[PDB]
Coordinates of C-alpha atoms and ligand atoms in Angstrom, one line a residue:
Chain A
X1 CA 6.4 -79.0 6.9
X2 CA 9.4 -76.7 5.9
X3 CA 12.0 -77.7 9.0
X4 CA 12.4 -80.8 11.0
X5 CA 11.8 -80.1 14.9
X6 CA 13.3 -83.0 17.0
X7 CA 14.3 -82.9 20.4
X8 CA 16.5 -85.8 21.8
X9 CA 16.5 -85.8 25.8
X10 CA 18.5 -88.1 27.9
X11 CA 17.8 -89.6 31.4
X12 CA 20.8 -89.8 33.9
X13 CA 21.3 -93.2 33.1
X14 CA 21.9 -93.5 29.3
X15 CA 24.1 -95.9 27.1
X16 CA 25.1 -98.0 30.4
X17 CA 28.4 -99.9 30.1
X18 CA 28.7 -103.6 31.6
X19 CA 29.7 -101.5 35.1
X20 CA 26.5 -99.6 34.8
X21 CA 28.7 -96.5 34.2
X22 CA 26.4 -93.9 32.0
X23 CA 28.2 -92.9 28.8
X24 CA 27.3 -90.2 25.5
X25 CA 26.2 -91.7 22.9
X26 CA 25.7 -90.5 19.0
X27 CA 22.0 -90.4 17.5
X28 CA 22.2 -90.3 14.0
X29 CA 18.8 -88.7 12.3
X30 CA 18.1 -89.7 8.6
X31 CA 15.9 -87.8 5.9
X32 CA 14.5 -91.0 3.8
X33 CA 12.5 -91.4 0.7
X34 CA 10.8 -94.6 2.1
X35 CA 11.3 -96.7 5.2
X36 CA 11.7 -100.4 3.7
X37 CA 15.6 -100.2 3.3
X38 CA 16.3 -98.4 6.9
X39 CA 13.9 -100.8 8.9
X40 CA 15.5 -104.0 6.8
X41 CA 18.9 -103.0 7.9
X42 CA 20.4 -104.1 11.3
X43 CA 22.7 -102.1 13.5
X44 CA 25.9 -103.5 11.6
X45 CA 24.7 -102.7 8.2
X46 CA 23.3 -99.5 9.1
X47 CA 26.3 -98.1 11.1
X48 CA 28.9 -99.9 8.9
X49 CA 19.6 -94.2 -2.7
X50 CA 16.9 -93.6 0.4
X51 CA 19.0 -91.1 1.9
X52 CA 18.4 -87.8 1.1
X53 CA 20.3 -86.2 4.2
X54 CA 22.2 -87.4 7.2
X55 CA 23.2 -85.7 10.7
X56 CA 24.8 -86.6 13.7
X57 CA 24.0 -85.2 17.1
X58 CA 26.0 -86.0 20.3
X59 CA 24.0 -87.0 23.6
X60 CA 25.5 -86.8 26.7
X61 CA 24.1 -88.6 29.8
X62 CA 21.4 -86.2 31.4
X63 CA 21.7 -83.9 28.6
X64 CA 19.3 -82.5 25.5
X65 CA 20.1 -81.8 21.8
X66 CA 17.7 -79.9 19.5
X67 CA 17.6 -80.7 15.9
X68 CA 16.4 -78.0 13.6
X69 CA 17.4 -78.8 9.9
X70 CA 15.6 -78.2 6.2
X71 CA 13.0 -81.0 5.6
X72 CA 13.6 -81.7 2.1
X73 CA 10.7 -82.1 0.0
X74 CA 11.4 -86.0 -1.2
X75 CA 11.6 -86.7 2.8
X76 CA 8.5 -89.1 3.2
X77 CA 10.4 -90.5 6.4
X78 CA 12.6 -89.3 9.4
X79 CA 14.7 -92.4 10.8
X80 CA 16.1 -91.8 14.3
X81 CA 18.9 -94.5 15.1
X82 CA 21.0 -94.5 18.4
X83 CA 24.7 -95.9 18.4
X84 CA 24.5 -97.7 21.6
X85 CA 27.0 -100.1 23.4
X86 CA 24.6 -102.9 23.8
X87 CA 21.4 -102.1 21.9
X88 CA 18.3 -104.5 21.8
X89 CA 18.3 -106.0 18.7
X90 CA 15.5 -108.5 19.0
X91 CA 13.1 -105.9 20.5
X92 CA 14.6 -103.1 17.8
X93 CA 14.1 -100.3 20.5
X94 CA 17.5 -98.6 19.8
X95 CA 15.6 -96.6 16.7
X96 CA 12.6 -95.1 15.3
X97 CA 10.9 -93.9 12.4
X98 CA 8.5 -91.2 11.7
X99 CA 6.4 -90.4 8.8
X100 CA 6.0 -86.7 7.1
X101 CA 2.5 -87.0 9.1
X102 CA 4.0 -87.6 12.4
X103 CA 5.8 -84.1 12.1
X104 CA 4.6 -80.6 13.5
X105 CA 5.7 -77.3 12.0
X106 CA 7.1 -75.2 14.6
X107 CA 6.9 -77.8 17.5
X108 CA 9.6 -80.3 17.9
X109 CA 8.9 -84.3 18.5
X110 CA 10.5 -85.5 21.7
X111 CA 12.5 -88.6 21.5
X112 CA 13.8 -89.8 24.8
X113 CA 16.8 -92.0 25.4
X114 CA 16.6 -94.0 28.5
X115 CA 19.3 -96.9 29.0
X116 CA 19.7 -98.6 25.7
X117 CA 16.3 -97.4 24.2
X118 CA 15.0 -94.6 21.9
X119 CA 11.4 -93.7 22.5
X120 CA 9.4 -91.4 20.6
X121 CA 7.1 -89.5 23.2
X122 CA 3.3 -89.5 21.9
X123 CA 2.0 -85.9 21.0
Chain B
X1 CA 88.0 -124.5 27.0
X2 CA 90.7 -123.3 24.6
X3 CA 88.6 -123.9 21.4
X4 CA 85.4 -122.7 23.5
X5 CA 87.3 -119.3 24.5
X6 CA 88.3 -118.9 20.7
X7 CA 84.2 -119.3 19.9
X8 CA 83.6 -116.8 22.6
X9 CA 86.2 -114.3 21.0
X10 CA 84.3 -115.5 17.6
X11 CA 80.8 -114.7 18.9
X12 CA 81.6 -111.0 20.1
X13 CA 83.7 -110.2 16.8
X14 CA 81.0 -111.9 14.5
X15 CA 77.8 -110.9 16.4
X16 CA 78.4 -108.7 19.8
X17 CA 80.6 -106.1 18.8
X18 CA 78.4 -105.1 15.8
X19 CA 74.8 -105.9 18.0
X20 CA 76.3 -103.2 20.8
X21 CA 77.5 -100.6 18.1
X22 CA 74.1 -100.9 16.1
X23 CA 71.4 -100.9 19.2
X24 CA 73.1 -99.1 22.4
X25 CA 71.2 -96.2 23.6
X26 CA 68.6 -96.8 21.3
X27 CA 64.5 -97.5 21.9
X28 CA 63.7 -99.9 22.6
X29 CA 66.8 -101.0 24.3
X30 CA 67.0 -97.4 26.2
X31 CA 64.0 -95.5 26.9
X32 CA 65.5 -92.7 24.6
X33 CA 64.5 -90.3 21.5
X34 CA 67.0 -92.3 19.2
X35 CA 65.4 -95.3 17.3
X36 CA 67.0 -98.7 16.7
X37 CA 66.8 -99.5 12.9
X38 CA 64.1 -102.3 12.7
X39 CA 66.0 -103.3 9.2
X40 CA 69.1 -103.8 11.2
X41 CA 67.5 -105.8 14.0
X42 CA 65.9 -108.1 11.4
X43 CA 69.7 -108.6 10.1
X44 CA 70.6 -109.7 13.5
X45 CA 67.3 -111.9 14.8
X46 CA 66.3 -113.4 11.3
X47 CA 65.3 -117.1 12.5
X48 CA 67.0 -118.6 9.9
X49 CA 69.5 -116.2 7.7
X50 CA 69.8 -113.7 10.8
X51 CA 73.4 -112.9 12.0
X52 CA 72.9 -114.6 15.3
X53 CA 71.1 -117.7 13.6
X54 CA 74.0 -118.2 11.2
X55 CA 76.6 -118.3 14.2
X56 CA 74.5 -120.5 16.1
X57 CA 74.1 -123.0 12.9
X58 CA 77.9 -122.8 12.1
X59 CA 79.5 -123.0 15.6
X60 CA 77.2 -124.7 17.9
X61 CA 75.6 -127.1 15.4
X62 CA 76.9 -130.1 17.9
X63 CA 75.9 -128.9 21.4
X64 CA 72.9 -126.4 20.8
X65 CA 69.9 -127.7 19.2
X66 CA 66.8 -125.9 17.5
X67 CA 63.5 -127.3 19.1
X68 CA 60.7 -125.7 17.3
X69 CA 61.5 -122.2 17.5
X70 CA 63.9 -122.6 20.6
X71 CA 67.4 -123.1 21.3
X72 CA 68.2 -126.0 23.6
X73 CA 71.5 -127.3 25.0
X74 CA 72.6 -130.9 24.1
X75 CA 72.3 -132.6 28.0
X76 CA 74.5 -135.4 26.5
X77 CA 78.0 -134.7 25.2
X78 CA 78.6 -131.3 26.4
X79 CA 82.4 -130.8 25.0
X80 CA 82.3 -130.8 28.3
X81 CA 81.7 -127.0 28.2
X82 CA 79.0 -125.1 30.5
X83 CA 76.9 -122.6 28.8
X84 CA 76.8 -119.4 30.1
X85 CA 73.3 -119.2 31.5
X86 CA 72.6 -115.7 30.3
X87 CA 73.5 -116.8 26.7
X88 CA 71.0 -119.4 26.7
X89 CA 68.4 -116.9 28.4
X90 CA 69.0 -114.2 25.6
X91 CA 68.9 -116.5 22.8
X92 CA 65.8 -117.6 24.1
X93 CA 64.2 -114.1 24.5
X94 CA 65.3 -113.3 20.9
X95 CA 63.9 -116.4 19.3
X96 CA 60.5 -115.4 21.2
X97 CA 61.0 -112.0 19.4
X98 CA 62.0 -113.2 16.1
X99 CA 58.9 -115.7 16.2
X100 CA 56.3 -113.3 16.6
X101 CA 57.7 -109.9 15.0
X102 CA 60.2 -111.2 12.1
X103 CA 58.8 -114.1 10.4
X104 CA 58.8 -112.7 6.8
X105 CA 62.2 -111.8 7.1
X106 CA 61.5 -108.1 7.9
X107 CA 60.0 -106.4 10.6
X108 CA 56.1 -107.5 10.8
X109 CA 53.3 -108.4 12.6
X110 CA 49.3 -108.1 12.6
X111 CA 47.1 -107.4 15.7
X112 CA 43.3 -106.2 16.9
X113 CA 42.4 -103.9 18.8
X114 CA 38.8 -103.7 20.6
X115 CA 37.8 -100.3 22.0
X116 CA 36.2 -100.2 25.7
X117 CA 34.7 -97.5 27.2
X118 CA 35.1 -95.2 30.6
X119 CA 33.1 -92.6 32.7
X120 CA 33.7 -89.0 31.2
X121 CA 35.1 -90.2 27.6
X122 CA 32.8 -89.6 24.5
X123 CA 35.5 -90.4 21.9
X124 CA 39.0 -92.1 21.6
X125 CA 41.2 -91.7 18.7
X126 CA 44.0 -93.8 18.2
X127 CA 46.3 -93.8 15.2
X128 CA 49.6 -95.9 14.2
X129 CA 51.4 -95.6 11.3
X130 CA 48.3 -94.0 9.2
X131 CA 46.0 -96.6 10.8
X132 CA 42.9 -94.9 12.7
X133 CA 40.6 -96.0 15.2
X134 CA 38.1 -93.9 16.3
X135 CA 35.5 -94.9 18.8
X136 CA 32.1 -92.7 20.0
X137 CA 30.6 -95.6 22.4
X138 CA 29.1 -97.8 20.0
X139 CA 28.7 -101.4 19.6
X140 CA 32.5 -102.7 19.9
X141 CA 34.3 -104.2 16.7
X142 CA 37.7 -105.5 16.7
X143 CA 39.8 -103.5 14.2
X144 CA 42.8 -105.2 12.6
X145 CA 46.4 -103.3 12.6
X146 CA 49.6 -104.0 10.9
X147 CA 53.4 -103.0 12.5
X148 CA 55.4 -101.8 11.0
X149 CA 52.6 -100.3 8.3
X150 CA 53.7 -99.0 5.3
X151 CA 54.2 -94.9 5.7
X152 CA 56.7 -91.9 5.1
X153 CA 55.8 -90.5 8.2
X154 CA 55.9 -93.8 10.9
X155 CA 54.3 -92.8 14.5
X156 CA 51.5 -93.6 16.9
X157 CA 49.1 -91.1 18.7
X158 CA 46.6 -91.5 20.9
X159 CA 43.6 -88.3 21.6
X160 CA 40.5 -88.3 23.1
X161 CA 37.0 -86.1 23.6
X162 CA 36.0 -85.2 27.5
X163 CA 32.5 -84.6 28.7
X164 CA 33.8 -81.3 29.8
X165 CA 37.1 -80.4 28.1
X166 CA 37.2 -80.8 24.4
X167 CA 39.8 -83.0 22.5
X168 CA 42.9 -83.6 24.2
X169 CA 46.2 -85.4 23.5
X170 CA 47.2 -88.4 25.1
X171 CA 50.6 -88.8 23.6
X172 CA 52.4 -88.1 19.9
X173 CA 54.8 -90.7 19.6
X174 CA 57.1 -90.6 16.2
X175 CA 59.0 -92.8 14.6
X176 CA 59.1 -96.5 13.3
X177 CA 58.9 -97.7 17.2
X178 CA 55.6 -95.1 17.9
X179 CA 53.2 -98.0 18.4
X180 CA 55.6 -99.8 20.8
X181 CA 56.2 -96.7 22.7
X182 CA 52.5 -95.7 23.0
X183 CA 52.1 -99.6 24.5
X184 CA 54.6 -99.1 27.0
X185 CA 53.0 -96.3 28.7
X186 CA 49.9 -98.3 28.9
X187 CA 48.6 -100.2 32.2
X188 CA 48.5 -103.8 30.7
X189 CA 47.1 -107.1 32.0
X190 CA 46.6 -110.4 30.7
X191 CA 42.7 -110.8 30.0
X192 CA 42.1 -114.8 30.7
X193 CA 38.5 -114.7 28.8
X194 CA 39.9 -113.3 25.4
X195 CA 42.9 -115.2 23.6
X196 CA 45.6 -114.3 23.2
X197 CA 44.0 -111.0 24.8
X198 CA 45.5 -108.1 27.6
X199 CA 43.2 -105.7 28.5
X200 CA 45.2 -102.1 27.7
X201 CA 44.4 -98.6 29.4
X202 CA 45.8 -95.4 29.3
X203 CA 45.4 -93.2 31.6
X204 CA 44.7 -89.8 30.4
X205 CA 44.5 -86.3 32.2
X206 CA 41.6 -85.8 34.9
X207 CA 41.6 -89.5 35.9
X208 CA 40.1 -90.4 32.6
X209 CA 40.7 -94.0 31.2
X210 CA 41.3 -94.8 27.4
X211 CA 40.6 -98.5 27.2
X212 CA 41.1 -101.2 24.8
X213 CA 41.6 -104.8 24.3
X214 CA 44.4 -106.3 22.3
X215 CA 44.2 -109.7 20.6
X216 CA 47.4 -110.8 19.2
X217 CA 47.8 -113.7 16.4
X218 CA 50.4 -114.9 18.5
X219 CA 52.2 -114.8 21.7
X220 CA 52.3 -111.3 23.1
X221 CA 52.4 -110.0 19.5
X222 CA 53.6 -106.2 19.8
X223 CA 54.3 -106.3 23.7
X224 CA 56.9 -108.9 23.2
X225 CA 59.3 -106.1 21.9
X226 CA 59.4 -104.6 25.3
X227 CA 61.7 -107.5 26.2
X228 CA 64.3 -105.8 24.7
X229 CA 64.1 -102.9 27.3
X230 CA 67.7 -103.2 29.1
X231 CA 68.6 -106.2 26.9
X232 CA 72.1 -107.1 27.2
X233 CA 73.6 -109.5 24.6
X234 CA 76.3 -111.6 26.6
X235 CA 79.8 -111.2 25.7
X236 CA 80.6 -115.1 26.2
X237 CA 78.4 -118.2 25.1
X238 CA 80.6 -120.5 27.7
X239 CA 81.6 -120.2 31.0
Ligands
LIG1 ZN1 4.7 -71.7 11.6
LIG2 ZN1 74.1 -132.4 19.6
LIG3 ZN1 49.3 -112.0 10.5

């Protein structure tokens, strides 16, 4: 794998406030050396040497964003974490991790944002 | 009353004449561009060493007593003078301001802001005296602010990012009163589930709301300075 292909698709109702109003959300994509530090870190820690590169994308409700960025050789894993208003911290449904093996060379992996969750759509 | 009338004259010569010259036609007393001097306001309303507190201690110790951070008339042995009710109301308002914003002997308070959310808003950027709070609809955290904060360019500003238009300015308010001017423009209501909380809402363009929760360390915090709007220091102590 040379480039990192990801597609982040949002449903109409994403990052819903208390009033049930859909809001835009920031999704962060991490190029990691290993998945231990990332996984062990909670929301607070993550959003204030495993980090090779970092990318932030803005996701609007009912919108889509395509990530095409150079995969740097050291990147054993890719971390996708959404800066949700009310994320489910017990379940940990606000983030996903993918190993290099999970990546296609020309084709993007589909990450679906719905409500307060990120789901990696099976290939 | 001859002693009382000479005291009314001492009050205007020692305090009111100077207060009026220094603060008339200036923000926050009037909604104008010209700013009242914060160091000079401190010289007048410092709780213990201020010009007003000194006149009260020196001339009214008998008939007027300090009760905590309040000024209370003596109900027994009035000499037998009648206070001008506007005078008691004025010194009580100023005591409340001093208690919240002039405790150190200079202007200075701390407060916290928690960003809210609204339809069509992607980002809010609130700046006061070089303290910045950027919010992008993530888990809301309380950010602590100081007013006035140390800077060569005091002021406050508020910008936002729309789902349709890009980054827009809500307002840009220069000067040492920047934050107070900004707060005055907000729609404010006392939030009874947060202490000491107020929900703040700035109405941006295209019906967009820029929402925050204000938590003060004491009383109304920076909102207390809005009590100076159209404030008149009475010309008499007694009727
Ligand atoms: Zn190819
Ligand atoms: Zn007395
Ligand atoms: Zn403080």
